[PDB]
Design an enzyme around this catalytic site. Structure first.
Site, PDB file in Angstrom:
ATOM      1  N   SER A  61       0.758  -1.242   0.000  1.00 54.85           N
ATOM      2  CA  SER A  61       0.000   0.000   0.000  1.00 54.85           C
ATOM      3  C   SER A  61       0.790   1.296   0.000  1.00 54.85           C
ATOM      4  O   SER A  61       0.200   2.365  -0.118  1.00 54.85           O
ATOM      5  CB  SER A  61      -0.997   0.026   1.128  1.00 54.85           C
ATOM      6  OG  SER A  61      -1.945  -0.995   0.950  1.00 54.85           O
ATOM      7  N   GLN A 117     -10.890  -4.888   0.815  1.00 52.64           N
ATOM      8  CA  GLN A 117     -10.479  -5.667  -0.328  1.00 52.64           C
ATOM      9  C   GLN A 117     -11.600  -5.850  -1.329  1.00 52.64           C
ATOM     10  O   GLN A 117     -12.779  -6.013  -0.976  1.00 52.64           O
ATOM     11  CB  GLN A 117      -9.890  -7.022   0.099  1.00 52.64           C
ATOM     12  CG  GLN A 117      -8.538  -6.899   0.799  1.00 52.64           C
ATOM     13  CD  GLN A 117      -7.910  -8.241   1.129  1.00 52.64           C
ATOM     14  OE1 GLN A 117      -8.085  -8.779   2.230  1.00 52.64           O
ATOM     15  NE2 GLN A 117      -7.152  -8.778   0.190  1.00 52.64           N
ATOM     16  N   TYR A 147     -10.360   2.682   5.672  1.00 56.32           N
ATOM     17  CA  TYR A 147      -9.251   2.455   4.756  1.00 56.32           C
ATOM     18  C   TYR A 147      -9.601   1.326   3.801  1.00 56.32           C
ATOM     19  O   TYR A 147     -10.031   0.265   4.248  1.00 56.32           O
ATOM     20  CB  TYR A 147      -8.014   2.105   5.583  1.00 56.32           C
ATOM     21  CG  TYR A 147      -6.764   1.818   4.811  1.00 56.32           C
ATOM     22  CD1 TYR A 147      -6.347   0.519   4.629  1.00 56.32           C
ATOM     23  CD2 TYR A 147      -5.992   2.843   4.294  1.00 56.32           C
ATOM     24  CE1 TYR A 147      -5.200   0.223   3.938  1.00 56.32           C
ATOM     25  CE2 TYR A 147      -4.827   2.560   3.580  1.00 56.32           C
ATOM     26  CZ  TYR A 147      -4.437   1.248   3.420  1.00 56.32           C
ATOM     27  OH  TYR A 147      -3.263   0.939   2.773  1.00 56.32           O
ATOM     28  N   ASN A 149      -8.802  -0.553  -0.308  1.00 56.99           N
ATOM     29  CA  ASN A 149      -8.282  -0.664  -1.665  1.00 56.99           C
ATOM     30  C   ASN A 149      -9.388  -0.407  -2.678  1.00 56.99           C
ATOM     31  O   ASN A 149      -9.137   0.129  -3.764  1.00 56.99           O
ATOM     32  CB  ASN A 149      -7.749  -2.067  -1.941  1.00 56.99           C
ATOM     33  CG  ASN A 149      -6.653  -2.453  -1.042  1.00 56.99           C
ATOM     34  OD1 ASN A 149      -5.890  -1.616  -0.562  1.00 56.99           O
ATOM     35  ND2 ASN A 149      -6.537  -3.751  -0.810  1.00 56.99           N
ATOM     36  N   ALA A 315       1.865  -3.284   2.957  1.00 60.13           N
ATOM     37  CA  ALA A 315       2.137  -4.709   3.098  1.00 60.13           C
ATOM     38  C   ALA A 315       1.572  -5.494   1.934  1.00 60.13           C
ATOM     39  O   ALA A 315       0.536  -5.137   1.363  1.00 60.13           O
ATOM     40  CB  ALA A 315       1.518  -5.225   4.393  1.00 60.13           C
ATOM     41  N   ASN A 340       6.180  -9.383   5.996  1.00 59.17           N
ATOM     42  CA  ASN A 340       5.158  -8.512   6.554  1.00 59.17           C
ATOM     43  C   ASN A 340       5.131  -8.560   8.086  1.00 59.17           C
ATOM     44  O   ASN A 340       4.413  -9.364   8.674  1.00 59.17           O
ATOM     45  CB  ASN A 340       3.790  -8.913   5.981  1.00 59.17           C
ATOM     46  CG  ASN A 340       2.655  -8.064   6.512  1.00 59.17           C
ATOM     47  OD1 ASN A 340       2.862  -6.951   7.009  1.00 59.17           O
ATOM     48  ND2 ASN A 340       1.444  -8.583   6.400  1.00 59.17           N
TER      49      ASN A 340
HETATM   50  B1  LIG Z   1      -1.997  -2.081   1.905  1.00 60.86           B
HETATM   51  O1  LIG Z   1      -2.324  -1.504   3.212  1.00 60.86           O
HETATM   52  O2  LIG Z   1      -0.671  -2.692   1.981  1.00 60.86           O
HETATM   53  C1  LIG Z   1      -3.071  -3.152   1.483  1.00 60.86           C
HETATM   54  N1  LIG Z   1      -3.180  -4.296   2.370  1.00 60.86           N
HETATM   55  S1  LIG Z   1      -4.192  -5.515   2.023  1.00 60.86           S
HETATM   56  O3  LIG Z   1      -4.470  -6.236   3.245  1.00 60.86           O
HETATM   57  O4  LIG Z   1      -5.433  -5.065   1.481  1.00 60.86           O
HETATM   58  C2  LIG Z   1      -3.464  -6.634   0.899  1.00 60.86           C
HETATM   59  C3  LIG Z   1      -3.845  -6.707  -0.432  1.00 60.86           C
HETATM   60  C4  LIG Z   1      -3.211  -7.650  -1.235  1.00 60.86           C
HETATM   61  C5  LIG Z   1      -2.237  -8.477  -0.683  1.00 60.86           C
HETATM   62  C6  LIG Z   1      -1.607  -9.452  -1.432  1.00 60.86           C
HETATM   63  N2  LIG Z   1      -0.539 -10.132  -0.992  1.00 60.86           N
HETATM   64  N3  LIG Z   1      -0.172 -11.023  -1.942  1.00 60.86           N
HETATM   65  N4  LIG Z   1      -1.083 -10.922  -2.957  1.00 60.86           N
HETATM   66  N5  LIG Z   1      -1.986  -9.955  -2.624  1.00 60.86           N
HETATM   67  N6  LIG Z   1      -1.915  -8.396   0.622  1.00 60.86           N
HETATM   68  C7  LIG Z   1      -2.507  -7.491   1.399  1.00 60.86           C
END
Ligand SMILES: *[B]([O])([O])[C][N]S(=O)(=O)C1=[C][C]=C(C2=NN=N[N]2)N=[C]1
Length: 358
Positions: A61, A117, A147, A149, A315, A340
């Site tokens: 992120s 997600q 927060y 994505n 992460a 991580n």
């Molecule tokens: B950001 O805060 O780093 C997003 N973190 S997350 O938990 O949404 C996340 C999305 C994808 C992945 C991922 N790892 N390996 N493939 N996809 N990990 C965390």
């Protein structure tokens, strides 16, 4: 390197690596504008490849800072406005809950409860439209931060629409290239694969998996040198020659919302400096960082404040990253690791280093 930097970096990171069992790590400190680099351990344990200044790490992120700046650049180009309804750029989003949700809301996680997600079941473009059409907000727009994505990733995808460019093409030509980030990638090319570290999760070598809106939300890979240059560029946007990119960087550090002691930028998050370290350390823990929280609108947004701790954690399954800087002191740090490990350990180490050097 100056002994003070050498000593506080090694004295802080060595124990961190031991406590967290981090297989490989790279750190850059930016001090009075200049970078100093440190590396430890392994990019690939099985092949005995060391971490070097050329090793690529998954930023996770931290990618959102690139997305926020690219969006800022699009605003500066006059291609979009943050006040624009999401439906201006996606007219097929006809469901009524989208009324009043603007690009600003998407960019800043304030649309009303878009989820962290995008479901893995979303594989096609039509799946993605279905997902947003069927999504039901828990909250009115502009009232709570969650927060996500699915929020800033959609912002990035929509922000580049008027340009006609793909997200990757836009990022390359408008952000990476002008800043000379020549080892920063949304998709790692075959020529660079020898430098791409493995991530480690439960002892297994892993790389990020494809997903909807991955590039926009968590999909950049970069080296410690390029990340140092990214920090330099965000520390001192006035040195950037491309006008819209300079302006976009400034827009991404404007303060749009406040929750607790933190201010939401575009991708970046900010606190006033001097900061209470317990507040950024504890605040970085996902128990707080990922929680639904009421926000206060900053009406109108405050322009980038030089006396700020500006930062972002990132992460993926196999990687942990952190960037923080203080513009008024010309001081910053990047920490890239191929595990991580917990956010507060990152921020604690960063604060110890920067506090000692300030
Ligand atoms: B950001 O805060 O780093 C997003 N973190 S997350 O938990 O949404 C996340 C999305 C994808 C992945 C991922 N790892 N390996 N493939 N996809 N990990 C965390």
């Amino acid at each position: 390197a100056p002994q003070q930097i050498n000593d506080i970096v090694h004295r802080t990171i060595t124990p961190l690596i031991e406590q967290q069992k981090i297989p490989g790590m790279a750190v850059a400190v930016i001090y009075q504008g200049k970078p100093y680099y440190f590396t430890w351990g392994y990019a690939d344990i099985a092949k005995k490849q060391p971490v070097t200044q050329q090793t690529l790490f998954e930023l996770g992120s931290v990618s959102k800072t690139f997305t926020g700046v690219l969006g800022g650049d699009a605003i500066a180009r006059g291609e979009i406005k943050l006040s624009d309804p999401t439906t201006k750029y996606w007219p097929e989003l006809t469901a009524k809950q989208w009324n009043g949700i603007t690009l600003l809301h998407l960019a800043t996680y304030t649309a009303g409860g878009l989820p962290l997600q995008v479901p893995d079941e979303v594989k096609s473009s039509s799946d993605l439209l279905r997902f947003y059409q069927n999504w039901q907000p828990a909250w009115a727009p502009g009232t709570q931060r969650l927060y996500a994505n699915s929020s800033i990733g959609l912002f990035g995808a929509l922000a580049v629409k008027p340009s006609g460019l793909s997200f990757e093409q836009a990022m390359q030509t408008r952000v990476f290239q002008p800043l000379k980030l020549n080892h920063t990638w949304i998709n790692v090319p075959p020529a660079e694969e020898k430098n791409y570290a493995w991530g480690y999760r439960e002892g297994k070598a892993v790389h990020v998996s494809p997903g909807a809106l991955d590039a926009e939300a968590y999909g950049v890979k970069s080296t410690i040198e390029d990340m140092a240059r990214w920090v330099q560029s965000n520390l001192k946007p006035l040195d950037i020659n491309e006008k819209t990119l300079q302006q976009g960087i400034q827009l991404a550090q404007s303060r749009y919302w406040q929750t607790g002691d933190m201010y939401q930028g575009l991708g970046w998050e900010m606190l006033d400096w001097p900061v209470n370290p317990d507040s950024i350390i504890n605040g970085s823990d996902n128990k707080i960082a990922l929680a639904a929280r009421p926000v206060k609108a900053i009406t109108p947004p405050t322009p980038a404040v030089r006396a700020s701790w500006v930062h972002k954690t990132g992460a993926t399954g196999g990687f942990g990253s952190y960037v923080a800087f203080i513009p008024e002191k010309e001081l910053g740090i990047v920490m890239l690791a191929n595990k991580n490990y917990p956010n507060p350990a990152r921020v604690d180490a960063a604060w110890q280093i920067l506090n000692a050097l300030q």
